[PDB]
Amino acid sequence: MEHVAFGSEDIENTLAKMDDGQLDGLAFGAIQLDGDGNILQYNAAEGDITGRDPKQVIGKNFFKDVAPCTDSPEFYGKFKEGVASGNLNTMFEYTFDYQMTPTKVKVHMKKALSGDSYWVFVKRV
């Protein structure tokens, strides 16, 4: 080793976020999902690295293989009424870390406009 390595994650989410490069999208963030809860962030506007996968979360259900905090059906009972209604629009909590570099975000989910889905921003706090 010397100055050529990495790990897995060292930010807060992915491409659609606060500020680190910024790209075409919304004005908050997004991870996007599908019917069962499969991440869709993999075909709309790639980040910026050019070498391999966008991240690794691809194909992994945000349900229990990406988020080491969501320990329930999905969010907190806000994806069974917002999905059936056809106008998801709810906020609560979700965090992102609790041992490395903690935080105190406030999540703002909605029935996506970037490509038909049920995203989960993170908001600016």
Ligand SMILES: *C(=O)/C=C\c1ccc(O)cc1
């Ligand atoms: C997600 O992490 C939600 C809650 C929670 C509560 C206590 C501790 O220690 C970690 C996480």
